[PDB]
């Protein structure tokens, strides 16, 4: 009743596909690191257990050859990374946005708010402004531009949109997350082994939603957002650091993120399940919920699945996104939301959430920060 | 009339070192080794002399600049040392402001439920919001919104964001902070970058914090209510302000008449919030019947808006006082003006917190050209 509702989802990826099985060959070739045979072997093994079949990239051999700073480990390179990301991030968002707007079916003049998330470059005016212009939205659309957010921002932009939609009668919020690995790509190094993780997992993509309260008869609800929270997990300081430098964006991984999340997930879920108890007067098991999880990597999914004793199918929508697109940072969990709905059609589910009533949407990022949302299916 | 997001506290902070504007050109051309640029210095002196600024506060000083020579060049690679400074000092200055706001508010910091942080000065992961959360020892489940690379309009933006947070979440108490340090923008003057002289003359450091919530309790003390908020891109303003983050730091380019564009459109911008006032009060105030909390972007914007709207000269005085004592502190500035408005209401024995008037306008502006407009009610 009046809850923020997802009315549409659209997604977009760069056209060029890179098969994960042969990515180590491409990567070590273009960075001129073929002499590092033991490192390449390590990287091949990481790629082989990544759960990824392919990723999509704007970057290719020609672009990297034209910008050799990007093929170094820590050579000066921010200016060319910015040139690419400032241009390509809004363009990829536009493609996702148009697909969401088509599904929604209303004129784009009815969009009142725009929330844009990215970790891929920064500019003034921001990507939100560029998207507003590219789409021809009204000049008085209220924008929130979330830069440098990291992997939790897909969930963050949904949390932000919830309050926009619920507190403003008639509001229709365009949410967009768009990520391009131009700012993080770099040569592999024996001195930066944690960098191999990002190099194996991160891919490009954008996703867009329309969110609003009080759907009209011609709108078609997909999910309702009933509860949202954000929290810093205990004993996680410095788990993920991301520094924007003259060499681009560099990540440092100093703790066991899968373990930390798994250790704390039951605690995380107590408040939203308490809310369900309030509304239903029942306590579902974790495996009675559907799951829309940031596909950060296979270990997080496996360990959460094990911790919460989920039926193997519960993580399938998330694993499917990982398989086809990899980890697209902020956009990823919105791809999972779309995949959840898509599988409900193809597998003839009773609801948009795997035939179940309540669902958990999870994003995580530097902090270590977890974003948790409680969804209801339609 | 009930339930509106309400400002419950304001606190501000600036770096301790004061730089007198009269002699800033001497300091600036000296530390950047540009004393041979006598005509350019002449120009900069003129710009400083008409800027409406008496002093600015800076973290940067001669010692730090001599230790980081890349920052004393025009476009030399220097982002890494600039980031080192900004990522450290921005949350620290915010903490000082936030502690002052929290004192005024008078409630335990465990009652803060949300944090909105705005800056244009550096970026990091985790963000400055996380750093402030940790510095203050707030609860780990405070809901944060981190607004980076925002520009001058973000004082108003964080207020707009906090309004929906406060209003849609019963009991919510939102800590808002904006903090700016000129480490990412300081650079040598150049005859090839004349628009750069404007920022060099105007930008200063500072931080401001608010507590915002709906439904104040009897032990809280409301200052202002936020009744209406809007954001708009002005026509014919494309490329007016561009800000690019490069290996040389943050570089601004100015390509149009910002005060002119704002003045041409300000009556139109104000139609919607004035129609809200008419809906609540059944009457239509003149512009000069409102109080004014305006981003002190520079003297020309204030002069031209004053003239266009036929404001009594006192209406812009809170804004001009901030410009005089602190310069343009980008996003934090308009929140200093809000504090100054309240401060002058006490010392000048005004009937309300907004210059003795009922309704007021809060304006921020930045790249787009984007204008943020909020309608305030005094207490």
Topology of chain A as a string of helices (H) and strands (E) = EEHHEHHEHEHEHEEEEHEHHHEE
Based on the structure given, which CATH architecture of the largest domain in chain A is correct? Answer: 3-Layer(aba) Sandwich
Q: Specify the number of helices of chain A.
A: 11
Strand order of the largest sheet of chain A: 5-4-6-7-1-8-13-12-11
Give the CATH level 1 class of the largest domain in chain A. Alpha Beta
CATH topology of the largest domain in chain A, anyone? Peroxisomal Thiolase, Chain A, domain 1
Shape of chain A: globular
Could you state the CATH homologous superfamily of the largest domain in chain A?
Answer: Thiolase/Chalcone synthase
Distance between the termini of chain A: 13 Å
Number of strands of chain A: 13
Rg calculated over all Cα atoms of chain A:
20 Å
* Whole-number count of domains of chain A: 2
In this structure, how is the largest beta sheet of chain A organized? 9 strands, mixed
């Amino acid at each position: 009743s009046g809850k923020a509702t997802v009315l549409a989802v659209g997604t977009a990826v760069p056209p060029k596909e890179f098969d994960q099985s042969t990515y180590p060959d491409f990567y070590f070739n273009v960075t001129n690191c073929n002499d590092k045979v033991e490192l390449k072997g390590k990287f091949q093994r990481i790629c082989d257990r990544s759960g990824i079949k392919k990723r999509h990239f704007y970057l290719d051999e020609e672009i990297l050859k034209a910008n050799p700073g990007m093929c170094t480990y820590m050579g000066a390179s921010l200016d060319v990374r910015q040139n690419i990301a400032v241009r390509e991030v809004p363009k990829l968002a536009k493609e996702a946005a148009l697909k969401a707007i088509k599904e929604w079916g209303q004129p784009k003049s009815k969009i009142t708010h725009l929330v844009f998330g990215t970790t891929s470059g920064v500019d003034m005016p921001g990507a939100d402004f560029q998207l507003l212009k590219l789409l021809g939205l009204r000049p008085n659309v209220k924008r929130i531009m979330l830069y440098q957010q990291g992997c939790s921002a897909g969930a963050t932009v949904t949390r932000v949109a919830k309050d926009l939609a619920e507190n403003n009668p008639g509001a229709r919020v365009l949410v967009a997350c768009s990520e391009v690995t131009a700012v993080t790509f770099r040569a592999p190094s024996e001195t930066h082994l944690d960098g191999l993780v990002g190099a194996a997992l991160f891919g490009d993509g954008a996703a867009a939603l329309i969110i609003g309260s009080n759907p009209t008869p011609v709108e078609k609800p997909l999910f309702e957002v009933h509860w949202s929270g954000q929290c810093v997990l205990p004993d996680s300081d410095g788990a993920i650091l991301g520094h924007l430098r003259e060499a681009g964006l560099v990540f440092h991984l100093l703790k066991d993120v899968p373990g930390i999340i798994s250790k704390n997930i039951e605690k995380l879920l107590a408040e939203p399940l308490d809310y369900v108890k309030s509304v239903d007067e029942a306590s579902p098991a974790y495996t009675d919920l559907f799951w829309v999880v940031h596909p950060g990597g296979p270990a997080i999914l496996d360990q959460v699945e094990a911790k919460l004793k989920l039926d193997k199918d519960r993580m399938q929508a998330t694993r499917d996104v990982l398989a086809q697109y990899g980890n697209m940072s902020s956009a990823s969990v919105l791809f999972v939301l779309d995949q959840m709905r898509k599988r409900s059609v193809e597998l003839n589910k009773d609801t948009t959430g795997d035939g179940l009533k309540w669902g958990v949407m999870l994003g995580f990022g530097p902090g270590l920060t977890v974003e948790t949302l409680l969804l209801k299916s339609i």
